[PDB]
Amino acid sequence: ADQLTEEQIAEFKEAFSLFDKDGDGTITTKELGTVMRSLGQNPTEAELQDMINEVDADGNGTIDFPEFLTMMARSEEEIREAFRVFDKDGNGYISAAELRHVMTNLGEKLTDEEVDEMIREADIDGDGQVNYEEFVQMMTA
């Protein structure tokens, strides 16, 4: 086996209450759409239904933490689009100022001490920024 330590079970819950803006425990389409339009994507009502049913195991309309937790654990294009969300200034790297805005507006509010923690973790070469390859590896898996 490879794993899923209790470091990630606490992080995916964070990623969890980011879509689940009201507590509830489930993430509805209104929530999925509200985070999307906030990430540069205005999707519709059926693209949203089509996304929550292909990830919601007990087909109950919503997505609770088990489902959210199974999906996020054991391809591309999409990443290129994702690399662009942060790289607002389209220059080939995502700095700590870029990571951070995207979150805020996303709702998150981290200190000046968690964005470096974040970049540092996914920053291979050592310069303090995140380039296209470092973003693909990080996410390939």
Ligand SMILES: CN1CCN(CCCN2c3ccccc3Sc3ccc(C(F)(F)F)cc32)CC1
């Ligand atoms: C192999 N490998 C192991 C670990 N990482 C860390 C990924 C860091 N990451 C990040 C980095 C740069 C730009 C954006 C992002 S999104 C993000 C969100 C949460 C976390 C969070 F919550 F964990 F901090 C880490 C990341 C990348 C690749």
Ligand SMILES: [Ca+2]
């Ligand atoms: Ca909710």
Ligand SMILES: [Ca+2]
């Ligand atoms: Ca469900």
Ligand SMILES: [Ca+2]
């Ligand atoms: Ca940039």
Ligand SMILES: [Ca+2]
């Ligand atoms: Ca780097």
